[PDB]
Amino acid sequence: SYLPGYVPKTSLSSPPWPEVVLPDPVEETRHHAEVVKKVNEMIVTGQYGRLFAVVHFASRQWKVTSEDLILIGNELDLACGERIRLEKVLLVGADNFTLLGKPLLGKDLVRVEATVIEKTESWPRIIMRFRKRKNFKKKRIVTTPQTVLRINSIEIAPCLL
Template sequence: MNVNLWKRCETLIKHVDQCWSITTGNTGPLRTLKSSRQVPFRPPMSFCVQRYFHVQSIYLSNRAKVSSEVTETEGIQRSQEIVQAVNSSINSEDLGRLFAVVHLAGFQRKVTVNDIVVVETSSYPTVGTRVKLEKVLLVGSKDFTLLGKPLLSRSVVNIEATVIEKTLSSMLISFLMLRRKRVKKTRMQKRQHTVLLINSIEVAHIEN
């Protein structure tokens, strides 16, 4: 064993003896060293201390379980109160102007009643057809907002629109030129657009 390490062990044992004598009142050393190569004495943890830590760990685990159950019950009560408040606001006459965020042709659009939306696609049917927008991400009023994860249920929100026009966009010109390659290309195109008129936004009652 290294000499410096052994000296440090001796000083540590002396310090432990002093603490032992102060706490218990015994003036004798805790354990005497017989040889210079003996490992310093390390008193084991008593049974009462082990039992205390065991009982405390059980108490803390039970306390965490009780607190989690309390938070779950409080969350359920809070959600029920919110659902009741939203249903009462839906039943009221002063609901205000509803708005919604819908997914149309790869883009999210915020719409309200009597809005005109231009969609860059030709997949919709002929002019005058009434369609239902089913991909609704959000709907709200002046008092509440319902947010889907990611979409709201079809039984909760109903948004209807009418196809009023199918036309082409303005001329789009794209020009390509490569220097010192004698490459010059001009491309002109028109994209197909469908114009929708939002007729109604309706919100049904929410179930608990």
């Protein structure tokens, strides 16, 4: 009762990691719909509290929530007090549910809006270079422009299905 590919159980006969069996894709496909519908049903009824959203702004990913501040090291050419929308959102999460973009969420699923509240120059930064025995010494001071944004609201819409 031994197959041609049979090996008796030894230390190296089987891989050290236990065998893993993936679910049936046909059976799992409808199982995903049940989970998505349940999570979508949590949005229409508003069964969520504070939401944290990961947005891509100024070549940077910010883990922001509502009513918080973020400092941006460049000028947006926007008057202070103007309300704008952050189009790129990569992740929106709650206490019980989390949605992932691939790599970005649709504009019909999440909306993050911020406000320009302060535009100021950076504190003086010292840029000095020195080389010994070469009379090489020069000092430069730069003040990069900065912009502060406050996240006002993070709202989602029931568009999962």
